[PDB]
Design a protein around this ligand. Structure first.
Ligand SMILES: NC(=O)c1ccc[n+]([C@@H]2O[C@H](COP(=O)([O-])OP(=O)(O)OC[C@H]3O[C@@H](n4cnc5c(N)ncnc54)[C@H](O)[C@@H]3O)[C@@H](O)[C@H]2O)c1
Ligand SMILES: NC(=O)c1ccc[n+]([C@@H]2O[C@H](COP(=O)([O-])OP(=O)(O)OC[C@H]3O[C@@H](n4cnc5c(N)ncnc54)[C@H](O)[C@@H]3O)[C@@H](O)[C@H]2O)c1
Lengths: 427, 427
């Protein structure tokens, strides 16, 4: 049994939702249909470190259907869906994940992905947030020798790739999947538009209409979060350090404020900064009784939970806790400040994960077949692959593409079949 | 009298709205405040070809307050605001613009900007759409010798710069102002979100709620147009050739369709493609009686108005015409298919033009002082200037910026004062 799940009996349930999820994930099904014969990933050995969810079970079974060998692990202690993990393990796939890991179990699960029976080594890393990349770079430099590349899923993991490259610490080729237009401008934005609401709802059942909600950060995650809340009738406030994102938020009608100023006025706070200690002890002490505080950025770092260890915690239900201040005023904290959408719900729905994961598979086929051509820097996929990803998803939602005539193509300077935009088009 | 306006008497009216517009344009007022002493543009001679509107009168008076010499002209035969043009001419500034130019008058107005009394030559070009750039490149190559650079305002003019560079025809340095984040993602999007409605309303007074509206194109102009219509209760349809933009539109809830399929179903059509003949004769013949057809892309090319010259035209009021088909069915065409927002209204409001025009002034200070450093290619302004532009506009709309601490700045790898994003961040 080369697996470690919480409950292997949930496999049938997991399989049932995986079947459903395949009808929601046309990108991966289409990648199956195209590459299942050739098996471009035959000989690949992939250490996965990405939320072990049902959508991820489809990505895994798609890499397998393309010939690859994998070992998986979640990148968050609360993000694994157990029946998904169970259905993967039942298929003979090594997976180490369960909802509710301790920090020690988490890093052991990561360690499990790096070695398998009969000297199984990875030549591929598939990493969401940089933890698997840092473990191999700092604790198995003997592993980095056989690694063709890493494909990083999220903004925070990409920033960590950059500081590595900046101090000559990045020692393998790295594909920024996060910055595929069909990841960043879709997953981070439209997915969080749906799963933040989900997380808040499952955790607290709080009415959104009429509440004052503060989004710290107006990147693609913040942009989607704010849409979510404003659509349910919340007054949305936005904090920003970047004047350009601040202006976008202002011009969508949000008031741009600082937490220093508004900590007493907010009913809900969502941290989406990817930064450190943007919610402090003084902020939480100033917050009103039963204020809901949650983090949708990648790391818990965003709130200073250390500053709440003095106080007494009363658990409400799993991943929903009260912190009681000395004056008896209570704060509701979701998932102890880890990813609220995956921690208190099920993350992004499968359809938008399909665009992200089609980008991941493509980057694995590409890292596995042409890694020689890449140095120890970060790169993004070509635009024509980005367009192919989007093209594979138009059918599911019934969007019909117009076809350029020869002269229209010449008129705007493009080939009929794309690419349709200059490299730095922002969409 | 080195000017040619329709009516010099409108100067006082123009001046009154210019004064108002200054309180809406903090970017240019702030640029005045910073650079009015030094006058970084002393010695500059700028041929302007950009919609002669009230906002543009502020940009012009700002370049003047920074020391420059200018001659102006609109880039559209219907876009000049006459009282704005009148107030500029009254200030002793040469301007050749009026609402209702013929094509011959238009190109003569452009020609006027290239020479002034006592051998006045331009060393600077400020061009919105490429017409001034093409005139100088193809009909005054003796002028190109003294030209430091051109700053291009719009997507279509940038595409024309690119085909020039691709065939070695671009012979001066060129600054893509359109692709400053604080132009493209603001002017094209939030401005058209407001002035398309304006144009349709002033021209026809048609109810938007309940109407089926088709946007051809889902770039930044199309994205804003669709927001505009959906917010007034229209059913919005979208056409696209780019699968990525098609997917964005689908995921905002628009149906993505082709005009070939839906020509009989639409009450309003807005062309926003920057392309050629996207509305054909067969489309217009299939359209319902009193269908409203308008173009918000840069050039009339988008509709095949030639194919309507057979038919009888009945004028409704200025820039609002009927085309009568042989079966007596009538189409409403705005501004004979030229820019509907500037042709049937007043273009974008001054505030968003201030962000665009602050980018223009910056690019003129930069082209005028460091043109040696640039070749005969297209370039964009540095991110730190983009951020400065946004920063100058936060105060007007009361957005308060959060300040990074030293450790937060290190945590995400940026300087406290910016730039805050990697170069290819898409916002
Ligand atoms: N929950 C999810 O499913 C999900 C999905 C994608 C990314 N993420 C994570 O969310 C975080 C943000 O993602 P993103 O893609 O929006 O990145 P982003 O860079 O686009 O957005 C971050 C924004 O926060 C702002 N910010 C940074 N520090 C701040 C501070 N102290 N105060 C106010 N604003 C501040 C930045 O200026 C930036 O605009 C990342 O850590 C990313 O890994 C989560
Ligand atoms: N009215 C204004 O105030 C204003 C402001 C900015 C730009 N513009 C003009 O509007 C035009 C578009 O501007 P933009 O910034 O949105 O450019 P853009 O490139 O972002 O958008 C153009 C979109 O139209 C799509 N398209 C092209 N041909 C098509 C076809 N045959 N069918 C369907 N879709 C098609 C493209 O795929 C693209 O997504 C440009 O000509 C620009 O100069 C006008």
């Amino acid at each position: 049994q080369d697996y470690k799940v919480a409950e292997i009996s949930l496999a049938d349930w997991g399989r049932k939702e995986i079947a459903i999820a395949e009808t929601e994930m046309p990108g991966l099904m289409a990648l199956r249909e195209e590459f299942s014969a050739k098996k471009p990933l035959q000989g690949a050995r992939i250490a996965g470190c990405l939320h072990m969810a049902i959508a991820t079970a489809v990505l895994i079974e798609t890499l397998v259907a393309l010939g690859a060998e994998v070992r998986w692990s979640s990148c968050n202690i609360f993000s694994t869906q157990d029946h998904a993990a169970s259905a993967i393990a039942a298929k003979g796939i090594p997976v180490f994940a369960w909802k509710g890991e301790t920090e020690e179990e988490y890093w052991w699960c990561v360690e499990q992905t790096l070695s398998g029976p009969n000297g199984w080594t990875p030549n591929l890393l598939l990493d969401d947030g940089g933890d698997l990349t840092q473990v191999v770079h700092q604790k198995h430099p003997k592993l980095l020798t056989a690694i063709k590349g890493v494909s990083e899923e999220t903004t925070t993991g990409v920033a960590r790739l950059y500081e590595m490259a900046k101090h000559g610490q990045l020692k393998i080729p790295a594909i920024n999947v996060n910055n595929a237009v069909t990841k960043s401008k879709f997953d981070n934005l439209y997915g969080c538009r749906e799963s933040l609401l989900d997380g808040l709802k499952r955790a607290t059942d709080v009415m959104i209409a009429g509440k004052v909600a503060l989004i710290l950060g107006y990147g693609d995650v913040g942009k989607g979060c704010a849409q979510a809340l404003r659509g349910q009738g919340a007054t949305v406030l936005v904090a920003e350090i970047d004047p350009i994102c601040a202006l976008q938020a202002a011009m969508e009608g949000y008031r741009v404020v600082t937490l220093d100023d508004v900590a007493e006025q907010v009913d809900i706070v969502v941290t989406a900064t990817g930064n450190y200690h943007v919610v402090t002890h003084d902020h939480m002490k100033r917050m009103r009784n039963q204020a809901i505080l949650c983090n949708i950025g990648h790391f818990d770092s965003e709130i200073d939970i250390q500053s709440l260890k003095q106080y007494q915690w009363e658990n409400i239900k799993p991943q929903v806790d009260h912190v009681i201040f000395p004056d008896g005023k209570r704060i509701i904290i979701l998932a102890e400040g880890r990813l609220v959408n995956l921690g208190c719900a099920t993350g992004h729905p499968s359809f938008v994960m399909s665009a992200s994961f089609t980008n991941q598979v493509l980057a694995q086929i590409e890292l596995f077949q042409n890694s020689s051509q890449y140095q120890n820097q970060v790169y993004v996929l070509p635009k024509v692959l980005d367009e192919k990803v989007a093209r594979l998803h138009l059918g599911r939602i019934g969007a019909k593409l117009t076809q350029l005539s020869n002269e229209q193509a010449d008129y705007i300077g493009v080939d009929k079949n794309g690419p349709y935009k200059p490299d730095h088009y922002r969409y």
